[PDB]
Structure formats: structure tokens, C-alpha cells
């Protein structure tokens, strides 16, 4: 959803 | 005790009061009038230094008179009357005529090196030279004089990331030469960063040591284990040393940090993405915001570090191509020329390439930032954000970039967990004022919009599936029944943004 | 040895002690009329320095004579009568004056004194500004100032939750000049908050520390663990320094707080939630009821935040509604600003729908509250409850709310001549301020609409529909048994009037 | 209070000042003139020894008088004219030359000085001898002495592992008599080299004891663990003591090392292998 | 009841 949360 | 004025005038006067003073004559001297005792005596008789005498005189002088008078009526007597001059003449220019003691009993000892001195003490960072955004730095030095009469207030040089204000601080405290000497006596530069809830206690021990002397650096207890009431109260009580103290926050996160400063009546710089930590302070609130380098000055940032000017027409396109892509940021900007390697706007163009199709990641550089990337930094932007917020943002890819565009057009792609979608509105608003992530603009139409670098963020980093999520899931509400924006009677359409609708598609296709 | 006057004169005629004067002079005048002793005036008299015999003579003076008179009748014959004429009408101006000075004002700005230096170190929070409750923060102020000769006292500024008490007490110690160095020496301003058994120690441990010199903050020694009946001897002790010294607890939920606060004599003001507490102390006990906020102060409380005011009808309603909604009630009020964003009526109106749907996680926001919603301050006060009493709350969703309805349409949903229901919502308007009494036409309780927002979206979705059908049952036995103005006793059997929010309610349990 | 050449006069004629003088002709003199008071009169006036009445006028003379005037205006009327013309003339030397002698040489044998004890000291290895790379050497003390002005600066001698940065650098600070002690005060040489994450910080922890004075090397604490901006406040603090100071950064491979140079505005000549 | 109260 959100690699790595960026 | 004193207060914070008449310490300021013992706290200006201390280059005199190093130069030419014993506290021996005077222990004597004020014993008789009754502020002191005979261990605080016996603590300051007996000290090798004069220096030691003179600061623990200083310090229990300030908790223990009621008033800053005898010490006026003892530099006269020893014909140390030089020093009781000044003194009495800073507190003539308080009480009677205010004001006037900035300009006249005040500024005649400003010194560049004096200046370089307290900023180096208070840690402040080293100003940058080959350019200064005027206008900012400007109204931050401005606004900062307008305060430093308050007993305590929040300034908010608040914006992206890398937009560049900790550095227009480093330039705002370092330009004039008023701000440190004249309107506040010291600095303190602290550098937040903090995520964690240990991390706001954290940095106020590294506060009330900021404000500790060389001396009392050694006597540092196992103070890592002491309760919040207690460092808050030895601040409050070491703050007494320091009259008007500017303290820079540099990096503030936590509105626990806000509610610290605001709970020690601190006198605060705040640098920032997050600006509704702001609500948590019930005081004097003030803000500057640290907008995207508009296109003219970062033409002036590029002659600024040697960078040739255009000549050819496919030349100031591909520089007006690199401030679109890199919509309006210093930070990338910077890592931009540090990568332009050749200097050719030749290859100029080919990272204008490499900007697209490889992301930031294309540029990542090592560079003034402490991030190779803009994208360590939003990161951090991206984690703190509500759940939900975390959402709405995630799916902001499937849009245009730098294009204006409806809340319904919106409504198609975000998320909610009936018939009025304002709750959209509500999160992208708080989506722009929360790391300037969107961008809101009210009229003509309430509309939002996302920037460029904003958006090649979120593409090499939101999952490729999403993105073509977003992509089938607009392409269904898209059918119902240039400087102007879309009409009502044209949204069925969105392939006006066919381009940058085919390079999504292409993209999530690899 | 002299008093305050006579020492004042020897203090503040030392400047002039200096440029002339000698106590040798002196010393066989005061050897003589046996007021000195020869080691005594050994002391002063060989003695390098003119600033040493000076400071020995009226150090050793002030023990040996019964007054300052030896001192008058000496340099009145020695020529320096300059010094003798000072001091006698000085002493004429306290033995021929019976009015002097008082605590007051005689060297200015005490902006910085008692505004700056106390309040900051006695820990009192930053005063709000842009609104103040006058009638509130004014009584308090006043009903101080009437106990600052007592020697010990509770005040009490009990409230709902985001009442605004707290604010209240952050005005009143700093709006006056009076309260704090007239009235009262030192301020000492701590958070309890206790909920756990160890609280109430650690406060008084920082109480304790309050007290304590800026010189031995360093010397704390690990003082965790050490009797109760010392840390109170040694506060009681630590507090002969500490003459008039008013005390505020704010947030007290533990009645063991007030006792120890009326154990060590203190001077307290409180604030707090539960009311009951003060049946912990047996003495002055005072109180100060933080009523809701009326429809105009909250006008007031916009108007004063930036808050466009009204102008078509269904908006001066939209704002009735918000000020209805969150009845009265300064915490939410200011979150729902916080979230006001385009500060619009429409989008003021788009909290409102919010509120009753998304109940008050539709309004949290970053505010100066300690608190995301208000929901997060009555959790503890559900908390700390009787569980009966937690039951009879629980309960109370399934009424209608801002209603004054009878004791008997309230003995059909709370659990158990049924008195005792009354009782309970008698505990439940006290601890917490979470009822409503209202004694005649007919002893008759109300539910406000926070109070009541709060359980929608909070109590058990099973227990509303449950509440909701055991209301209708036993209206339906007392069927069997055959504005301004309460609902009549021949028509409980019809709570159809309340329908409109039955029906919203029913809704919610059953979906 | 006087200044470096009123204080340089009264230290300098003092084995002039103890064969003919005595405090207490002037005590009175300078109680006169309102320069000093009657307890300082008081400790200078009850005094044993000779050398106690002249150590105590010399230590309590410098707070109170705006100059050194009433001292001249004494030496004179007193038949002690052999030293109050020593002092005319050494203030004629002053007030009168606007030239004296600079950071120069008049104790000759600097050869043990900064040859010996300062680059020893500062940790700057043992410069080569047997070839020396003219240009280069030379290039590095030019660029280096354009700079002593500056508060804070980076100097990149940058090159090929084993391409031989370190040995000019040493031969750089030893070479020359200008660099250290004319243009900077003392020399820090510290070899960096670090690669994890912990030297960067353990570097300035040996920067932070190569300021610490001979004495208090012993009081050295368990520093190891205390925060990155108290071992830099206690440099910047203990960087009072060290007015222009030279840092060679031999070995930097982390461009950590060289943020925290320019945190704590650090004059930094830097050897490294990356640019 | 009381949804964590
Ligand atoms: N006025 C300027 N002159 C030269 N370079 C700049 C300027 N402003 C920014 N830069 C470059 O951009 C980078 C980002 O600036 P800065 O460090 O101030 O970001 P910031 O606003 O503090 O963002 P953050 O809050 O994320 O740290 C700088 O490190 C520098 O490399
Ligand atoms: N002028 C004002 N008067 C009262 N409350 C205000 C005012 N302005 C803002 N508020 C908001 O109301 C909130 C509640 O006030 P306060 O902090 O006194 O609550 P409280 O009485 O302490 O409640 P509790 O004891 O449960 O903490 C404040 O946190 C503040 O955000
Ligand atoms: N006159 C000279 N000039 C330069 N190098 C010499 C000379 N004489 C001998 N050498 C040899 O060249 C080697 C490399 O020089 P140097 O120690 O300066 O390398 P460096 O530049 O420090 O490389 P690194 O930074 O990777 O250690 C020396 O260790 C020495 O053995
Ligand atoms: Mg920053
Ligand atoms: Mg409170
Ligand atoms: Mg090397």
C-alpha cells in the first residue's frame, strides 16, 4: 500500500 | 529576586562586570544590607577564581535581593562607579523612559564577534550566503522585534519540506545585528526531530543543559531519570540566568514540544511542515509561511550558485521544466545543481528525464539537506498523518499535476467511510496544512490541487496497485448522465489530462 | 534585639552609615550605658577596615539592647547629628505614625514580579486571554481574598469535564495583583490527576519539592522511599519558609489528595470533576459551581475567537444547535472552532450533522485541552464509578435529553418505592456533573446532550435497544394501570411526544 | 581596567619595581585622586613584607582607574623618576608609535616551540624530509594563510589513496613558521578514518580532550554516553581557550564528520580520498 | 458495556 511508507 | 529586566542589565553589563569587579569588596559591603547569609558569604569568600566569585555572586545575588539596588550603591563606593553608571542608567532607561534602552544603553556595545560568539554558544546553524530569500528573512527579523518586548510567544516560519526555513531562521538570527544582543540578550538553537513520547522530555533536558554553565556541565546527575515537574521546575529556576532568551525550535513535530514551551512561558521560533500543532498554544500566536520558490526567484537561486543562463527558447523551457517538476523547492533544487554535474543545460534536461521516470531517485544527492532525497523527508510527513489521511493522500496520485480541479472530481477517487462530500474537502485541507502536501485555493470554485514533486513522491512509492485502482475507480464516475478551470459541463471528460493519465497507465504497467 | 522598623533603619540608612561614622566612638559609649560587653567591643575595635567595625556594630548591636534608643543619644553629641536626625524622625515617623505602607506598592512593575517570576515558578499555567469569565474567575478571585487570613481552607471550582475550571483558576491567580504577594505570599500550582494508590504520594513528593530552595534541587535524594508521615512532617517543616502559601490542585479525582491536603493544614484551591470529595474534610469548605456555558457567553466566546455572527434565521438556529449540542460547554466549543476551518456558517452547519451521526469524533481536534474529545475526559469519569452507578449512566442513553422528565419515567430503565433511582442520579449529577436535578414542580432529572452523546456512540449497541424496548414495555404497564411546563402524569403512557429521537435512537441499536 | 600594553608595562618593570617602591606613598596619592578606597587602601597599607604591599597595588591597581595615568603622575614627584621614565617612554612608545611588533620573533629559537612542542602536542606527524612535493606544499600554506582571517572554513586536499594528501599536510604545518603561531594559534590533528556510525562522534570526543588541559585529563569522565549536542556545546565551550585553531581532519571518508566540522564552526583542513 | 469504558 505504501512502500515501506515511503 | 530580581526579574527578567534588571538581570538583563546584569547580564549586559558582564564583560565589565568581568573586566573590572570583586565580589569580596562587596560581601562586605552586603552582608549589612541584609541579602545574603553566611554560608552564601562563606560559598563566595573562598574561590580560586574571580570568575567563580563573580558567577556564584551573580547567581545568588538575582534569587536573593529584593531589588537591584544595592549594588548600584556599592560600584559608586569603590570607584567602580564606571559600572553603576551603566546600570543605574539601563534601569533609568526601563522604568522612566522605556524604548529608548534598545537604542541608547544598549546598542552602543554591538560587536560582529560578540554576535558570532552567542550564536555559537546557542547552537545556531551556520547561515548560508550565495542567496538569501530577502522578503522572508526580512519579515521573520521584523516580527521577532515586534515581540521581543512579550513575555512569551510562538512565531511559526511554517511550510514543505525543504522549503528552506530553518535555513532563512539560520539567516534571520545571523543578518541583523539587533535580534541577539539588543532584543534578546542569548540564543537557543535546539534541533527537535521527535517522534517518539520520550523524545519531548528528551530535548528539554537538553535545554535546561543548553542553559547551564561550562561550569555545572560536570555536576550533570542521572537526570536521563527525573520526573517532568522536576526538569520544568529547574528550568524555570536556571532561566532566571537568562533574561531575554530567544529559543529556536528547529524541527518541532509533537505539539507536546508547544505545549512545553507554552507551559515554561518560553519565547519561541518554531520551525515546522506540521502547522496545527499550533492550536495546542493558548497564547500569542504569530505566522510566516515559507511558501514554494516562486519561478523569478529561483532563476535568481540558479545565477545565485553559477548556474548559465538560457539563451535558446528550448533552454529557459527546460529550466521552467525543472521549477514545474521540482515545484518550487529549495531543498531539491540544490540536490538538483549538486547533480548537474557537466553544468550543460544539456544535462540539465537529461535529469529533467531522469526526474520522471526514476523519480527523485534520479537526483538524490548528497547536499546541504541532511536527506540524499526529498523523499526520506515526506517519509516522516506521511507516517504522523491520520489513518485516513494516510488514505487520501495515498490515492492523490491518480491525479494531474499542477491543474486545478474540483471536489466532486475528488470525491471520485478518496475515500470515506450519502449524497454531500465536504468531508473531502475536510481532508485535503487537512492534507495541505499538514506538510503542505495539497495546496487549497478557494475561488473560483473551492478546489484543491497537488503539486508535482508532491506527486512523483507518491508515484515510485504508493503501491502500483493502487494506482491503477485509482485509475478504474475515476474512470467509472467519469460519465454519469490553461488558466481557467474545468467546467461542469465538461468533467466526463478527464481526457483533457490524457497525457498524464497515458503515463500512469503506462506506469502501472511495467 | 529590634523588629522590622528599627532594623529597616538600620538598613536603609547604611548608605548614609558609611560616608561617616565610627563605632569606636561608640564603643565606650555603648561598654557604658551596659548595652556592650569589652569582647563585644574587642570585637569591633580592632578591626582593619572602617567597613568591618561598621558591619560588626550593627550586626553585634541588635542582640544585647532592648531597643534603638543607645544609638539616637550618641550621634546627636558627636557631630554627626545628620545621621540621629534621620533616624528620630524616622522613629518618629512609626512611634508617632500608626500608618505606614501596608503590602503594597512602592517599587513598580511587579508585571515582572508577581505576573513573571511566582506564577511561572509556583508552575501556574499561562493565563487565557481572549476570553475571560468574568462573573466565574471574579467570585473566585473575591472569595479568596475574604479566607487569606485563614490558616487553612478549601475552595472548591467543581465542574463538568471541559467546564472550564482549570482556566478559570489560570485567570484568577493572574489577572488580580492582590491574590498573590497582597494576599498571599507564594503559589504553588500542581496537577494531581491521580487515579492509582501512589499518586497521591508522588504529588505531595512534588509538593514537597515545590518548596524546596533553588540551592538543594540538586541534593534530592531518592526520597521514593520513605514514610508517609515523614514526607508530611518534612512538608510541614519545609513550610515554616513558606508564610501565606496558596495552594491549587489542579484536577483532583481522589478524595486521599484532600485528605492529606487537610492533614498538613494547607491552603487549597481544587479543581475537579466530583463534587463529593469535600465530604473527605471536616471544615471551611467552599464551593464554586462552574455552571455551563449560557446561549450568550458562548456568544460571547465566538464573537471573541473571530466568529462571524448571524444574520438569516436558520443560521442564528445552526448556531443554537451547536451551542444546544455541546451544552454549553467550553472544551468542545473550542475544538469545534479548531475544526471550523473555512469558519463559514455552512461548514459550522456540516459539524452540526456531524456531531449526531460520527457523535463527538466529529468535532476532536488539536486544542489547548489535554484532550483529542471531551469523550476522552468522561472516559475517566465513567471510570472512577460506583458500578452501579456505571450501570444507571449506562442506562440513561434511552431518555430524552434536554428534557426535565419525572423519577418514575426513570425507575423503568435504571437497574436496581423506588427513591433509590433518584439516589443514584443524585451521585450521578454530583460525580461529574453528569445529571441534572431540578426539585419542583416534580423532583425531576434531565439529561443535557453531550452527557448524552457521549453513551450513543459509547454504550453497548445491544444495551440502547434494550433500554429502548424495557422503556417501552413498563410505559406500556402503566398503560395497563387504567416548553416551560413538565410533562403531566396522565400522559407518561404516550413517549410518543419523544418519538423523533426514539426513533433516531432506535436506528442506531438495531440498524 | 588597563589592556595587553599597560599590563605588558607594569609586568615587564617589575624587576624594576621591586629595587626602588613602595605602595604607600601613593596609597594616599590614590586615595586622592579616586582610583582606589580605604579598604583597598586598608589591604594594601597592613602588610608585611615589601613584596605584599607591591603585589597587592599591582593586582588592586588595574580594576578601578580608567588608566594608567596616576601612576606616571607619581613615580615622578616621588624622586623614584627612573621608573615613571620608563613608563613615559614606553607609553611614548605606543601612544606615540603606531608600530611596535606584531606576531613576529624576539625569543628566538621558535624551532622548539612550534617545531617541537606544538605540532607534537596537536598530534601532526613527523613531516618528510628526503622529498617534498614543492608545489602542492606550497599551494596548501598560501591557501591556508589567505584564510587565518576567516572564522570558519573547509580546505579539501583531495586525491588517490596513497596519492600522498596526509604527508603534505605535514609538511604543510612544519614546514613554514607562519601557520602556527602567526596565523593560527595551535594545531588539532586528529585521523579520522571512520566508518561506522559511532566515530564520528568518538572523533570529536577526542577533539573535546585534544582542547582539555594537562591538567584535567585525569578527571576525565565516563563520557562515552552523553548527547551529540552537549559534546559539541562542551567543544564550542572548551573552544573559548583555543583562539584561531587549525584542524586537520586526516583520513575523512563520512561526509558526517565534516556537518559536524560545520556545526561547530570549526577552521578545518581536510585530507580525504572522496570528493 | 462501556466499549472500554
Ligand atoms: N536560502 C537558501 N540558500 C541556499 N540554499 C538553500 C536555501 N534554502 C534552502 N536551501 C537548500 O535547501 C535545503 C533545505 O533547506 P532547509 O534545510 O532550510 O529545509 P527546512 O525548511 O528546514 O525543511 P525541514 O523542516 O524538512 O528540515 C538546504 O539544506 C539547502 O541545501
Ligand atoms: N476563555 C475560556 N474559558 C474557558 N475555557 C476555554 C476558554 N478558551 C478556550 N477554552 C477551552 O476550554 C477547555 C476546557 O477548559 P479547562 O482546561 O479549564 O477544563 P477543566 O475545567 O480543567 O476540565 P478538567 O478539569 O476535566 O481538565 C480548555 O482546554 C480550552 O481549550
Ligand atoms: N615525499 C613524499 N611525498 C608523498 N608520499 C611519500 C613521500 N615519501 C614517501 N611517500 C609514501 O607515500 C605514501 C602515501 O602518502 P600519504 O600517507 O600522504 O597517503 P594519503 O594521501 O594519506 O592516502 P590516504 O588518505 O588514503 O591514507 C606514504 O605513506 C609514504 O610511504
Ligand atoms: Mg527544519
Ligand atoms: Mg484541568
Ligand atoms: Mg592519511
Same mark, same amino acid.
Given at each position: ?6 | ?38 554560608? #552564601? ?94 522578503? #522572508? ?317 508532491? #506527486? ?40 483533457? #489530462? ?13
Amino acid at each position: 500500500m505504501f512502500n515501506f511508507l515511503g | 529576586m530580581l526579574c527578567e529586566i534588571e538581570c538583563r542589565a546584569l547580564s549586559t553589563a558582564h564583560t565589565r562586570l568581568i573586566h573590572d569587579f570583586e565580589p569580596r569588596d562587596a560581601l562586605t559591603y552586603l552582608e549589612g544590607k541584609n541579602i545574603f547569609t553566611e554560608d #552564601h558569604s562563606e560559598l563566595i569568600s573562598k574561590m580560586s577564581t574571580r570568575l567563580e566569585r563573580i558567577a556564584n555572586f551573580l547567581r545568588i545575588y538575582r534569587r536573593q535581593a529584593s531589588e537591584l539596588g544595592p549594588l548600584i550603591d556599592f560600584f559608586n563606593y569603590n570607584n567602580q562607579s564606571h559600572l553603576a553608571d551603566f546600570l543605574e542608567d539601563y534601569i533609568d532607561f526601563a522604568i522612566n523612559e522605556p524604548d529608548l534602552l534598545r537604542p541608547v544603553v544598549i546598542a552602543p556595545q554591538f560587536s560582529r564577534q560578540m554576535l558570532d560568539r552567542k550564536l555559537l554558544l546557542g547552537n545556531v546553524p551556520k547561515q548560508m550566503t550565495c542567496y538569501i530569500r530577502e522578503y #522572508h528573512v526580512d519579515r521573520v527579523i521584523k516580527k521577532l522585534d515586534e515581540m521581543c518586548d512579550l513575555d512569551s510567544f510562538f512565531l511559526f516560519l511554517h511550510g514543505r519540506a525543504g522549503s528552506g526555513k530553518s535555513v532563512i531562521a539560520s539567516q534571520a538570527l545571523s543578518k541583523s545585528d539587533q535580534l541577539i544582543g539588543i532584543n534578546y540578550d542569548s540564543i537557543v538553537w535546539l534541533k527537535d526531530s521527535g517522534t517518539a513520547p520520550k523524545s519531548t522530555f528528551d530535548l528539554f533536558t537538553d535545554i535546561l543543559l543548553m542553559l547551564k554553565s561550562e561550569d555545572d556541565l560536570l555536576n550533570f546527575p542521572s537526570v536521563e531519570h527525573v520526573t517532568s515537574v522536576v526538569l520544568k521546575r529547574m528550568i524555570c529556576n536556571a532561566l532566571i540566568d537568562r533574561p531575554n532568551t530567544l529559543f529556536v525550535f528547529d524541527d518541532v513535530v509533537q505539539e507536546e514540544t508547544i505545549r512545553w514551551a507554552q507551559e515554561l512561558r518560553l519565547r519561541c521560533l518554531v520551525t515546522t511542515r506540521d502547522v496545527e500543532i499550533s492550536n495546542a498554544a493558548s497564547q500569542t500566536c504569530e505566522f510566516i509561511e515559507v511558501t514554494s520558490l516562486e519561478i523569478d526567484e529561483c532563476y535568481d537561486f540558479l545565477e545565485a550558485y553559477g548556474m548559465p543562463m538560457p539563451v535558446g527558447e528550448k533552454e529557459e523551457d527546460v529550466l521552467n521544466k525543472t521549477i514545474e517538476l521540482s515545484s518550487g523547492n529549495p531543498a531539491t533544487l540544490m540536490m538538483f545543481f549538486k547533480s548537474c554535474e557537466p553544468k550543460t543545460f544539456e544535462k540539465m534536461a537529461q535529469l529533467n528525464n531522469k526526474l520522471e521516470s526514476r523519480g527523485l531517485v534520479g537526483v538524490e544527492c548528497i547536499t546541504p539537506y541532511s536527506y540524499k532525497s526529498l523523499a526520506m523527508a515526506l517519509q516522516r510527513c506521511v507516517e504522523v498523518l491520520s489513518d485516513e489521511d494516510r488514505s487520501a493522500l495515498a490515492f492523490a496520485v491518480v491525479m494531474p499535476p499542477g491543474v486545478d480541479i474540483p471536489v466532486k472530481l475528488w470525491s471520485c477517487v478518496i475515500p470515506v467511510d450519502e449524497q454531500l462530500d465536504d468531508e473531502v474537502a475536510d481532508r485535503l485541507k487537512r492534507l495541505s496544512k499538514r506538510g503542505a502536501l495539497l495546496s487549497g485555493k478557494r475561488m473560483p470554485v473551492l478546489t484543491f490541487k497537488i503539486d508535482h514533486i508532491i #506527486h512523483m513522491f507518491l508515484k515510485h512509492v504508493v503501491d502500483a496497485q493502487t494506482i491503477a485502482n485509482g485509475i478504474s475507480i475515476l474512470e467509472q464516475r467519469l460519465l454519469e448522465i490553461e488558466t481557467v478551470i474545468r467546467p461542469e459541463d465538461f468533467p466526463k471528460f478527464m481526457q483533457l #489530462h490524457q497525457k498524464f493519465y497515458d503515463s500512469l497507465k503506462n506506469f502501472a504497467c511495467c
